[PDB]
Design a protein around this ligand. Structure first.
Ligand code: HEM
Length: 448
């Protein structure tokens, strides 16, 4: 079969279709029109967008396809280097760092981070407890304060102190602007200026982290956090530790990857909850039932099953890292009808996969956490908000524990009002979030 292709613009092929504020949402609409697979051409390159479980289950075959670095990751690599997320599977530093860091996300591990997650969560709850009568909450803004601070602290014993500030840490300023620059390049001497902003932003991140690192190294203080592993750990395979250059790239990688998608998730979860008050009520009832002490235990967070389902349903509809790229390891045939050559690229459009009616049924647009009651019933590779195989999200357990803890405490401590009847507006960076989402929270007056 010859695959569908969306409208073209002469020499530019399909490229101008990505010249928009919301390219992922544009691609979802294109998938709606064209179906499970479509070719997308630009000057110099081609990729194929996949939307069905039927074809994505094959794309996820690691014997046939490996992770590809999208043009976007490639631009990010300019400051994330060969950190885990921006490295090729075949680079020595990918396997090394992967082996050395995996244990920092073991069960013994989330247990060790729990206390510090609670430290930041409590700061969130106290902020909301201290609001005056008719004030409101800027949701993603506050969720980003929480997720950033949580990775900074749990990961490296560094306090960004986001809740003591109105404006951003000088890191995010440097960081967001870099990502901004990074994204922007997607479409482009007129341009000598952004480069200096870029190199300066880059300089901000490195100098901090590089001190964050030799600061620790010298004092020699005794920890067991992420940094501790990046500094002391040895890859069982090569027997080698990471060097200081890669260590810094990992910190930059985790700070970024370790908060933006997580803030998005919390923001979408709260949005779906206020839009579906019966679901909010069911989740609030679990929170009250389970969280019987002033602050949650690790064991209690594990018992917030319905909260966990709410979070998976939010990831179904709006996975906050909405796409990942692959390349063919050898010539192969996709789905029995699409011949591929070695090197050919695929893109997995996760929000479309999560709307495949053959898997989820007709009601795919409805928010129903109960879909996740029996996870064993879900076919392979049908739900993929954390990517695939050995290149899947190493931070998955960290993200879900933090989100479940925080949303649990939120539902325990406040009732929520959608006071503006907020109209969902999804802003696209490298991730997704509901821009301008606000709520009012009424305290239940339960002390910490
Ligand atoms: C809801 C929150 C998150 C979502 C939806 C998410 C999503 C993803 C996805 C889809 C990938 C695969 C990327 C690709 O194939 O190109 C990935 C990789 C990765 N993520 Fe996450 N992520 C989340 C949170 C986190 C957190 C909290 C951390 C760190 C604490 C993190 C660190 C990483 C790293 C290091 C990789 C690359 C791993 C490797 O290739 O070895 N992510 N993430």
């Amino acid at each position: 079969k010859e695959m569908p292709q969306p409208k073209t613009f002469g020499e530019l092929k399909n490229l101008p279709l990505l010249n928009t504020d919301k390219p992922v949402q544009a691609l979802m609409k294109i998938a709606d029109e064209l179906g499970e697979i479509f070719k997308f051409e630009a000057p110099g390159r081609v990729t194929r967008y996949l939307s069905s479980q039927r074809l994505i289950k094959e794309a996820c075959d690691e014997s046939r396809f490996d992770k590809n670095l999208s043009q976007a990751l490639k631009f990010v690599r300019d400051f994330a280097g060969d950190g885990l997320a921006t490295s090729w599977t075949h680079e020595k530093n990918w396997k090394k760092a992967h082996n050395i860091l995996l244990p920092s996300f073991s069960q013994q591990a989330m247990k060790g981070y729990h206390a510090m997650m609670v430290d930041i969560a409590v700061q969130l709850v106290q902020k909301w407890e201290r609001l005056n009568a008719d004030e409101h909450i800027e949701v993603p803004e506050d969720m980003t304060r929480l997720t950033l601070d949580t990775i900074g602290l749990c990961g490296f014993n560094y306090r960004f102190n986001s809740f003591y500030r109105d404006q951003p840490h000088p890191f995010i300023t440097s960081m967001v602007r870099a990502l901004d620059e990074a994204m922007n390049k997607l479409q482009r001497p007129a341009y000598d200026e952004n480069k200096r902003q870029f190199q300066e932003d880059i300089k901000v991140m490195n100098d901090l982290v590089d001190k964050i690192i030799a600061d620790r190294k010298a004092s020699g203080e005794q920890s067991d956090d992420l940094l501790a592993h990046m500094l002391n750990g040895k890859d069982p395979e090569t027997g080698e530790p990471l060097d200081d250059e890669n260590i810094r790239y990992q910190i930059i990688t985790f700070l970024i990857a370790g908060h933006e998608t997580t803030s998005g998730l919390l923001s979408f979860a709260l949005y779906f909850l206020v839009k579906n008050p019966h679901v909010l009520q069911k989740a609030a009832e679990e929170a009250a039932r389970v969280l019987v002490d002033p602050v949650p235990s690790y064991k209690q967070v594990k018992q917030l099953k319905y909260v966990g389902m709410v979070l998976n349903e939010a990831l179904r509809l709006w996975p906050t890292a909405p796409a990942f790229s692959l390349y063919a390891k050898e010539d192969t045939v996709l789905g029995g009808e699409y011949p591929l050559e070695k090197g050919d690229e695929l893109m997995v459009l996760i929000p479309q996969l999560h709307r495949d009616k053959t898997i989820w049924g007709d009601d795919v647009e409805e928010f129903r956490p109960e879909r996740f009651e029996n996870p064993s019933a879900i076919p392979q590779h049908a739900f993929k908000p954390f990517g695939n195989g050995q290149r899947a999200c190493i931070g998955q357990q960290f993200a879900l524990h933090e989100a479940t803890l925080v949303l649990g405490m939120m539902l325990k401590h406040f009732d929520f009002e959608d006071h503006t009847n907020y109209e969902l507006d999804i802003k696209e960076t490298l991730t997704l979030k509901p821009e301008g989402f606000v709520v009012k929270a009424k305290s239940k007056k339960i002390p910490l």
